[PDB]
Amino acid sequence: RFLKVKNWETDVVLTDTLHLKSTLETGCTEHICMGSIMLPTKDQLFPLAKEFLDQYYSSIKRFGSKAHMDRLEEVNKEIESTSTYQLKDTELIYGAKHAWRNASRCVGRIQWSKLQVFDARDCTTAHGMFNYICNHVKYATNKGNLRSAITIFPQRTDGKHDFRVWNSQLIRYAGYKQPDGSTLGDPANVQFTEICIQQGWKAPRGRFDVLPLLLQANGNDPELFQIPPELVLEVPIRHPKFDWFKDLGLKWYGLPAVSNMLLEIGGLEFSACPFSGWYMGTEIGVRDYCDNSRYNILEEVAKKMDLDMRKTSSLWKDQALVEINIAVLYSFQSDKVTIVDHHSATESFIKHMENEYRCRGGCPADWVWIVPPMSGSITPVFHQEMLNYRLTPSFEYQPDPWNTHVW
Amino acid sequence: RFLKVKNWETDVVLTDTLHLKSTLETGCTEHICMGSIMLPVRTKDQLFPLAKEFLDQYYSSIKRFGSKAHMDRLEEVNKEIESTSTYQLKDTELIYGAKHAWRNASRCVGRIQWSKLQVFDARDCTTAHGMFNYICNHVKYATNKGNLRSAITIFPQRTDGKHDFRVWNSQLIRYAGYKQPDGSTLGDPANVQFTEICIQQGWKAPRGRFDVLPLLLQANGNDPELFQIPPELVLEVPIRHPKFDWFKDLGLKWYGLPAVSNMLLEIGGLEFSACPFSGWYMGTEIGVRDYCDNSRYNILEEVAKKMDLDMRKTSSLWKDQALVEINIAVLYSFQSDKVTIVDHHSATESFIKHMENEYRCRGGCPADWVWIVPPMSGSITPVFHQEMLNYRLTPSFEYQPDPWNTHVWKG
Ligand code: HEM
Ligand code: HEM
Ligand SMILES: Cc1cc(N)nc(CCc2cc(CCCN)cc(CCc3cc(C)cc(N)n3)c2)c1
Ligand SMILES: Cc1cc(N)nc(CCc2cc(CCCN)cc(CCc3cc(C)cc(N)n3)c2)c1
Ligand SMILES: [Cl-]
Ligand SMILES: [Cl-]
Ligand SMILES: [Cl-]
Ligand SMILES: [Cl-]
Ligand SMILES: [Zn+2]
Ligand SMILES: [Zn+2]
Numbered sequence: 010r011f012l013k014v015k016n017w018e019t020d021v022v023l024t025d026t027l028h029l030k031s032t033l034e035t036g037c038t039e040h041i042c043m044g045s046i047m048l049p050t051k052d053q054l055f056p057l058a059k060e061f062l063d064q065y066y067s068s069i070k071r072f073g074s075k076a077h078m079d080r081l082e083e084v085n086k087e088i089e090s091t092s093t094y095q096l097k098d099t100e101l102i103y104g105a106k107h108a109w110r111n112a113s114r115c116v117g118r119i120q121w122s123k124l125q126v127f128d129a130r131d132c133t134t135a136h137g138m139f140n141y142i143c144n145h146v147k148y149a150t151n152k153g154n155l156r157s158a159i160t161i162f163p164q165r166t167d168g169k170h171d172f173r174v175w176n177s178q179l180i181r182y183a184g185y186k187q188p189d190g191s192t193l194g195d196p197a198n199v200q201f202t203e204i205c206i207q208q209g210w211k212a213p214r215g216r217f218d219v220l221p222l223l224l225q226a227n228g229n230d231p232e233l234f235q236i237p238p239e240l241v242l243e244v245p246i247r248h249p250k251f252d253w254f255k256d257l258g259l260k261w262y263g264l265p266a267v268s269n270m271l272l273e274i275g276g277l278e279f280s281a282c283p284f285s286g287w288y289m290g291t292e293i294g295v296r297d298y299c300d301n302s303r304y305n306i307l308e309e310v311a312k313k314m315d316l317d318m319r320k321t322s323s324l325w326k327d328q329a330l331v332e333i334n335i336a337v338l339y340s341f342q343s344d345k346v347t348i349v350d351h352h353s354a355t356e357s358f359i360k361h362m363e364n365e366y367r368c369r370g371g372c373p374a375d376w377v378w379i380v381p382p383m384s385g386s387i388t389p390v391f392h393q394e395m396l397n398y399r400l401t402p403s404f405e406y407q408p409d410p411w412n413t414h415v416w
Numbered sequence: 417r418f419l420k421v422k423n424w425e426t427d428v429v430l431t432d433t434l435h436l437k438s439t440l441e442t443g444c445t446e447h448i449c450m451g452s453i454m455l456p457v458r459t460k461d462q463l464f465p466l467a468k469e470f471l472d473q474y475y476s477s478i479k480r481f482g483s484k485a486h487m488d489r490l491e492e493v494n495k496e497i498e499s500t501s502t503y504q505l506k507d508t509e510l511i512y513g514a515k516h517a518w519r520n521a522s523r524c525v526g527r528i529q530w531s532k533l534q535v536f537d538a539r540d541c542t543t544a545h546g547m548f549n550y551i552c553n554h555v556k557y558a559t560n561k562g563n564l565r566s567a568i569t570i571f572p573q574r575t576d577g578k579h580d581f582r583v584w585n586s587q588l589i590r591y592a593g594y595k596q597p598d599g600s601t602l603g604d605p606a607n608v609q610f611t612e613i614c615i616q617q618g619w620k621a622p623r624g625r626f627d628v629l630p631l632l633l634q635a636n637g638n639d640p641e642l643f644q645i646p647p648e649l650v651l652e653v654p655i656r657h658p659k660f661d662w663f664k665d666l667g668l669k670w671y672g673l674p675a676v677s678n679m680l681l682e683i684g685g686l687e688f689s690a691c692p693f694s695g696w697y698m699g700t701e702i703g704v705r706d707y708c709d710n711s712r713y714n715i716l717e718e719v720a721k722k723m724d725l726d727m728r729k730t731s732s733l734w735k736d737q738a739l740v741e742i743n744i745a746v747l748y749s750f751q752s753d754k755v756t757i758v759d760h761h762s763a764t765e766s767f768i769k770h771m772e773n774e775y776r777c778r779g780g781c782p783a784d785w786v787w788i789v790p791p792m793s794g795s796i797t798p799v800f801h802q803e804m805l806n807y808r809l810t811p812s813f814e815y816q817p818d819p820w821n822t823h824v825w826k827g
């Protein structure tokens with residue numbers, strides 16, 4: 010109701026008033042904190058619409074103006090008549106930027122206002138979706154000098170005509186289970202890869218096979234498309250000191266682009282709204298490369314550095330982990346593909362959070378996600394108390410469509 | 417109601433029922449999570465239920481629930497409360513209580529060990545001098561020449577809140593910090609304020625980088641008193657690195673015995689405001705936190721200078737490199753001197769096995785992810801990918817305000 014957050018490294022105390030405008034629910038109760046769980050009608054719509062428009066018109070400093078009232082009237086009339094309503098371009102651009110501004114798990118938010126928004130509300134077919142996505146990918150990649158972007162397909166209507174991108178990211182590598190029993194490629198993508206082969210994809214059956222897009226337009230059955238290979242910028246991974254590192258045959262793609270979330274603005278639901286920024290290095294070197302359920306390369310790198318792997322207390326895992334991460338950052342930098350390291354990224358977020366407290370009265374942040382997955386306490390976010398709550402406009406999770414889709 | 421937690425690395429799903437026995441509050445509401453906030457006189461009326469529920473837990477655990485002995489103990493405690501406003505725990509209840517507070521401590525990665533806790537009952541203690549003696553015996557027993565043993569010493573419980581026993585130190589063993597006129601700090605900056613108090617109370621400070629603090633001890637609500645732990649009872653480890661011969665020349669060392677002395681033990685409604693407890697270190701506590709926090713010894717720069725890392729840009733990951741070597745050094749030093757220490761890989765693996773075992777046997781294991789996950793190498797430890805549920809069970813360890821803010825000076 011008037012909350013304080015302390016930074017334990019610096020002693021700075023900040024006060025949060027923004028949480029009073031909190032809308033959705035957290036998962037937590039007074040008896041039980043769910044902070045570390047990954048996923049914890051016309052009547053309904055007008056309140057949601059009003060609340061959003063009120064925040065839109067106050068942001069442009071015309072709250073209570075005729076233009077404010079007139080728009081509220083017009084949206085109200087349109088909902089009564091058509092049971093939905095259409096956002097103005099300005100309202101759409103504002104809402105998408107704020108969905109990012111509100112993303113409590115995103116360390117990269119200092120950038121929130123520089124999002125490029127592509128309005129794909131005129132799209133009608135999976136083929137249109139594919140053209141729109143290719144242009145997004147190329148615009149955002151920008152020869153390695155990456156730029157934030159989102160592409161917004163038509164909103165949900167009766168729930169039977171959803172646009173969806175079936176892929177979880179625009180760019181990801183396939184996964185195949187072997188006769189052997191091991192996994193070839195990225196183990197995270199095995200089920201989706203099976204859906205693609207099931208739908209006709211000719212799988213190359215390599216380690217780093219860029220998956221086809223599977224696109225669903227207007228609630229129709231999804232269709233398959235291959236992104237032009239020349240549009241998928243990749244980086245081979247080398248180490249600035251270890252000659253042998255390149256012989257692991259490792260590479261990653263430059264563009265991180267989340268494609269399976271739902272964007273809710275003023276009550277309306279944009280179920281296909283892929284968005285991309287650029288990588289923080291640990292995302293690849295720690296998660297993609299080192300998670301036991303991902304490419305899982307810690308053991309091989311350690312073996313090549315010739316460390317004493319007999320006992321955990323030599324910190325051989327920790328040594329190999331730092332080196333993999335050095336290689337990731339070095340490789341992206343040498344090829345001039347935008348990347349940020351966790352020190353720089355978290356320092357930036359702390360400056361952002363201070364701005365947001367000063368100018369907005371708050372910044373919802375989820376500590377579990379904001380603190381990098383290596384070297385936590387040496388980054389400034391570790392010691393920063395944070396309050397996690399849900400503001401709207403927002404990005405939300407939604408079920409994988411192959412569980413939902415009547416074929 | 418059943419609550420499921422998932423592990424994202426293995427896909428194992430567990431079901432929590434234990435949360436149904438949750439009593440205290442989390443700080444969280446349906447609108448706000450306070451999972452990353454550090455900090456979240458009893459009448460007869462409130463006391464009997466709290467006593468009753470504790471004694472029911474105790475009697476269940478010994479398979480005597482509903483026995484004549486159980487019922488007599490309830491009646492006995494009941495009368496004692498209405499007649500004297502409080503009650504005294506049997507020794508077995510105190511032991512069981514103290515083990516449970518640890519079992520229930522959701523920020524503790526070390527809990528696989530909870531059932532091996534040496535409890536020293538110091539409820540007959542009446543003076544600060546008595547406290548000193550009890551604490552020296554704790555330290556010597558727990559140190560055991562490097563082969564560390566868990567232990568807790570329990571002084572008399574709160575009565576009217578005007579007669580509290582308190583250990584004013586935050587740990588039994590910690591190093592002084594001295595703020596200098598030039599703004600710099602000598603020793604441990606975490607302990608500057610407490611060092612000022614000790615000096616104000618009459619301690620002659622050596623003013624070095626690693627001076628062991630005196631104990632400042634309050635018995636029966638009296639003004640506290642200073643005592644020097646016998647130097648021969650303070651086990652220390654000089655820090656060296658297995659490959660880098662210049663590391664020793666940094667002048668680093670640390671004490672072997674981690675001993676938390678400022679918490680409150682609640683059992684069956686009763687409040688034990690002095691209850692120092694100790695185990696052994698996980699290496700990261702010294703190497704990541706005590707050495708590398710900026711508001712602590714802050715050695716990252718100096719170590720990286722010596723390794724001659726590229727310090728011109730954070731993206732060389734020079735900080736991460738110095739951090740690993742420092743932590744390698746801490747573990748190597750303790751092992752070489754035969755003083756118990758655990759690395760974070762080993763400790764988190766143990767905790768995950770503990771936790772699964774707790775789910776099967778107990779129906780839950782409350783855990784605080786923010787604290788359980790280590791401050792380096794988070795995700796290559798098996799706790800990172802483990803969903804946890806955080807809730808509060810009694811008996812428990814609780815925070816209490818520092819006694820210098822609340823103490824009524826007798827003079
Ligand atoms: C500027 C480049 C960006 C960087 C460096 C960045 C950084 C991150 C990181 C590190 C995570 C957590 C992943 C992890 O745990 O390792 C994250 C999550 C997230 N980011 Fe950002 N981000 C950026 C751009 C964006 C943009 C443009 C949006 C939306 C427009 C966005 C919205 C989110 C959302 C919704 C999540 C959480 C996804 C989930 O809950 O699963 N990010 N981002
Ligand atoms: C046996 C060796 C032990 C190890 C390795 C161990 C490990 C830890 C670690 C790593 C933390 C978090 C400290 C940090 O890194 O910030 C912790 C916190 C805690 N531990 Fe354990 N522990 C051990 C024994 C015990 C014992 C014997 C007790 C009490 C009987 C205990 C109760 C707690 C409590 C109450 C906290 C939270 C402190 C706070 O909230 O500030 N620990 N322990
Ligand atoms: C727009 C954008 C930019 C950027 N740099 N990074 C992102 C990351 C989004 C993302 C995607 C995934 C897909 C699955 C694995 N690659 C995963 C994550 C983080 C997952 C995660 C899991 C768990 C269990 C904890 C935690 N802190 N984070 C985050 C998005
Ligand atoms: C009995 C016992 C054994 C053991 N190995 N470790 C402990 C924990 C002691 C402890 C001591 C302090 C005082 C300062 C350290 N020198 C602080 C803490 C909590 C540290 C902490 C702070 C913050 C801000 C976040 C976080 N995750 N952890 C924990 C207790
Ligand atoms: Cl990724
Ligand atoms: Cl992950
Ligand atoms: Cl410590
Ligand atoms: Cl800390
Ligand atoms: Zn992971
Ligand atoms: Zn919570």
Ligand SMILES: [Zn+2]
Pocket residue numbers: 386392705709
């Ligand atoms: Zn710290």
